[PDB]
């Protein structure tokens, strides 16, 4: 059964005013028996976020499809609050998907 295995089934990271855009969150890595290449998205239908976050629900991250490298896209305010948690899939050249679960954390500064 050739398709994407990701490495881990939940990746997490934490966010908080002390950041500043294009800070790597984390990397994203699935593996496939036969070498076929790999692309990683943010299925954007999963992207649950606190009502605080409502406007950077789209724009808070960027996702490299290629490497899978998660980069914060937003400077987190004072008034961020709460999580985001959404599924990021694997797709492999013949279309064969795996998904895992992704939370971020708005972490709590002075
Ligand atoms: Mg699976």
Request: glycine share 6%; net charge negative.
């Amino acid at each position: 059964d050739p398709r994407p295995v990701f490495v881990r089934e939940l990746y997490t990271a934490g966010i908080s005013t002390a950041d500043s855009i294009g800070r790597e969150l984390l990397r994203l890595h699935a593996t496939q028996s036969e070498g076929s290449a790999i692309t990683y998205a943010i299925d954007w239908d999963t992207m649950v976020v606190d009502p605080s976050l409502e406007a950077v629900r789209q724009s808070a991250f960027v996702l490299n499809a290629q490497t899978g490298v998660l980069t914060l896209n937003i400077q987190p305010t004072a008034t961020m609050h709460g999580l985001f948690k959404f599924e990021v899939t694997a797709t492999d050249t013949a279309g064969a998907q795996d998904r895992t679960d992704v939370t971020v954390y708005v972490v709590s500064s002075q």
